[PDB]
Symmetry: C4
Subunit: 321 residues, 4 copies
Amino acid sequence: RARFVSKKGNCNVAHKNIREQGRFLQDVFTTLVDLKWPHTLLIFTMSFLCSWLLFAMAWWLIAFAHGDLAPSEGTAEPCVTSIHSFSSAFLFSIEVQVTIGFGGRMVTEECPLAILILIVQNIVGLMINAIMLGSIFMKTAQAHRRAETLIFSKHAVIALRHGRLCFMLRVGDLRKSMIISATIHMQVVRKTTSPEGEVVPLHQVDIPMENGVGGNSIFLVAPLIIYHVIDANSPLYDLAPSDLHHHQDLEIIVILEGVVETTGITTQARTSYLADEILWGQRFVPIVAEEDGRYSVDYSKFDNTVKVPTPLCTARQLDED
Amino acid sequence: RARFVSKKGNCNVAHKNIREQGRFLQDVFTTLVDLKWPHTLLIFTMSFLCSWLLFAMAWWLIAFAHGDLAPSEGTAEPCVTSIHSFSSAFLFSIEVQVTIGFGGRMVTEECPLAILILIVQNIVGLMINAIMLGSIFMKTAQAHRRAETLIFSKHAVIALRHGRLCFMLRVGDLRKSMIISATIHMQVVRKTTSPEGEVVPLHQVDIPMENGVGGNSIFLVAPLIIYHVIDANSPLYDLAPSDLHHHQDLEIIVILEGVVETTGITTQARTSYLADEILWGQRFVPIVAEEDGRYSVDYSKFDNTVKVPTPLCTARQLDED
Amino acid sequence: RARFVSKKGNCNVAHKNIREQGRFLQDVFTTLVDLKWPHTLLIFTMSFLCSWLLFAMAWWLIAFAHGDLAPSEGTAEPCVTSIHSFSSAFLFSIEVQVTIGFGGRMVTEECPLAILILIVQNIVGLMINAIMLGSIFMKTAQAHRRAETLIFSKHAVIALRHGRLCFMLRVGDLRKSMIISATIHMQVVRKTTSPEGEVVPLHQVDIPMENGVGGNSIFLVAPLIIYHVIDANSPLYDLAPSDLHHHQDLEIIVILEGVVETTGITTQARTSYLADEILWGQRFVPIVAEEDGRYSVDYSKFDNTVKVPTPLCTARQLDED
Amino acid sequence: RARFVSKKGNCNVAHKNIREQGRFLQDVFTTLVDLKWPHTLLIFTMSFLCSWLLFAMAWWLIAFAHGDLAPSEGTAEPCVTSIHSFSSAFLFSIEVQVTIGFGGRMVTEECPLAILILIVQNIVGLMINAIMLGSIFMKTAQAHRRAETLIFSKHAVIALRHGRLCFMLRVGDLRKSMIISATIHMQVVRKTTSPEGEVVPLHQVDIPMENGVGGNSIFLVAPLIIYHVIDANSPLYDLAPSDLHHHQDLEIIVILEGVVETTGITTQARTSYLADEILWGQRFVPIVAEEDGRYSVDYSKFDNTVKVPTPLCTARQLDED
Ligand SMILES: [K+]
Ligand SMILES: [K+]
């Protein structure tokens, strides 16, 4: 009735009553990267513009204190040439911080405080440039968007494979570039009650993906059927074909995590299957076919299935009779 | 007749009928890095040039609306000095965005809209500089080219080792810099039919690499012979010496993945062995030899083999008689 | 009486009598990033300012040797225009290295040594800019601060689960962004004496986290109870409920390590439980609850426990009677 | 007589007769980062200087073809102002590519080819800046220098632990910052002969590190004794106390690999123990001690050992009698 993970991978958690809000300010960079894109553009533009405005007010105060803003000229040279307005000081601060340097307004050697302001503005401008440009590149380069081209099967099935019952699903990579060291973790999530009376409201029990070697590591080029053999040690060992209705406390989440080959940042796609999205007694259709010396996958047939005859009984009363 | 992976690691897949083309636009950065090099240089040059052209048209419209392009001069100062052509506006836009700042054309404090255009151009120029330079460095620094100096054996062998039959091959690192945490995943890929009637067209079954500890983790300095012991749990357990002809549905792919020590980006080399590239009854020649206090590998003898006597029978009828 | 790891993850080690101090200078970059923030800002500002000062002294010596500082002018052009003070040379060095380029002081083609000084200053400025800006971004982007939003239970418990005794604790993620490929390593740290007489003063024995598949890999969205089953192979197999006093040589440290999804840098949080922070005969309260179609965790109830009846005997004399 | 790995981690391999030298040019970036530091500085300086020289020759040819180098002036404006020498063209090319922009030499709107040269120079300058600065930061930031502060024991021992014989050594971290997800791989390297006659000249057999959970993953804060239990499945199972002489074909290499917490790049330290650097019948001294509420390690006592009584027989004739 309320799913843990959405079909696109969004987690439906609320995080209520976080009391220790002070530790959120101990990692400002994670919160800065973790923002939305309008807030990221706003903080980018605001950081640069307020740095320019602060140093513009500094240059304007220097030109005031030297008496350069007053047009009563004698022969003494200003600290900065041709500054006679706050707009002039703002243009000069932009020219210094962006390192444009038009030269209509340049620092002269008259004011020793102006050289200190120039040094401080250059240092803070280099620091702001580094921390902001690196942050915006890290934001536009993070690999959680690569999960958009990692498709899963819309429905999972439970079918007879090699005399056992297996929970099978299909995961496909949509582009040419591989995902390096891809691993699959499937978790049965439901409310469990311990025999001693302990009730775990959202218990996540790992179901081992049948691989052949035991380790969970796939090579994803063609869309391959990831399946878990319902053994005696599996929490689906008492799952019934009539138990796959809606409003059933059972949800199998799948977490595929790897390294994107192009960027190099570790990505993680995830999906979820409720009890009504699990089709008992069906199996996937083969979509890989050889044509003209290459292999071809028909991604339109990705989630198509066929009703094959399986017994309508649990894996336990299949293992015994 | 049509191989899954090429000998150089290219995958022969087609990806037909990708219907959800809308999610390809949800990760624009992966597609941007994933381009070819002519398209990458074209989009780099085009992004910078069109940003300069757009802001040049903006500066030209400002100089038009102020009346600076008209040479009927009075005494009022322009927004930008010495702009009297679209070529002048283009040179000024290049000077602002690249932050050259020659100063023949500089922003004056007359036009308040010109200061806003300067601020917007500086912000968009910083953003474009970050996203483009970081992308081109990430493109020229990705580690999928490191696989060019990770050579594999041209032929794999099947030979008697320690009383068993073992599928052996040779992988060598061609340069001094190591590959950190290198792991080997070998997969037998063929068409399989389940006993319940399910036909998997391209089934990839992991064969465990014999390592001594079970885990697949190698230390690649000298070219070492990676071998898999054909046990009762191995899908090659019924492989015959006469089954190693061409047009035989059997292909063993090898995936070596690690971290490049110099760059730090996870790389993955891969190769493939068809049924005719597997030499029954042969073994590799030793190429490591000590000279003058160091070890030396003769990389010219990399794929040389020698016909040693092995039985001409399957691993099953070797295990029993 | 003296803990190995603090509750926040700080290690209480001293590193006395490090004799080979020469190898600390073989990785200058690790020491540079490893500094505190005042030292980092000081070395940043000092590197830039001393580079500007060194090249300013170079430009001043060039202007001296050409005779440009002497105001006895004829008609010969200077190497750099309008330099007549060390303050002028300093402003020119700042304009060259920061690439501002006002143009009141520009390099002329008269002095061939000035062109060489300009080339050397540009090369060293580009190198210093790269190595300093990348270092400060790597410093502000390192993921050891992400551990501030990875909370652990303040107390751990030992409770009856599924007929066994289990050492349980609770770890929660405080923000939306996941931590990819999170693994948990728990270690019992105490002084051990081998039966042959060998005394290990700080022995760290790995206790396996009960996961279902054996591998230590969690999916941290909701705060989940990490527990280790006290089996016959566990070093807590002889732990008593009366042995959980202070001044007891026993400390269980927990190390959660993963990849931050936003930044991509591997992070590691760690915590510790002394013998008095382990509550025998208690268990955690369920804090996950469904409201309005989503799940919600009450983080104020994070470390609340309830005294449930467990036997007051060791796991050995529970396993037998 | 000739060791595989040096004590500092350098591999003594030669890589003779690399025939496929063409694939070395397919990854130019790995070779560029893989250079020595004098070659890196030389190629950095040479790339920037030759780009400036090439575009300087371009600007000089433009000023020639327009007739600006000829001092026979009329009234027509040059393409670039105040260029009358190749030194002037070189200074202008430096000002354009470094984006200094003094403004004594600025692009005018007279020459349409000069605008194209300016665009091409800006694009190539941005590309060269990205690829060079990122490469030099990646070079100075690579984590193979972090192995200088990961010390190993100078001698390894073989001692009685828990009734078995164990090969023990000591690895210490020299600085405060941890190494995340540190794993240890020990390999016995020697010449082996298969019972079928196959001679492997440098065979590397993995010996499993005794950890408690089986997995090789350490938590390195204090210098801890890494030991491998000589079991029946271990290749040291027939190692004798008299077999630990020099000129004995046996060498145990140790590979510790992890993630540096500060930088985030995966590092790998490695060491080696010949047959004479393995002390039979000795064990390490405890160097961890509690003082004033903290723990302290005496790194001067790092490689000190004590001769404890062990039997002078192999692990096989210890297992039986
Ligand atoms: K400039
Ligand atoms: K200028």
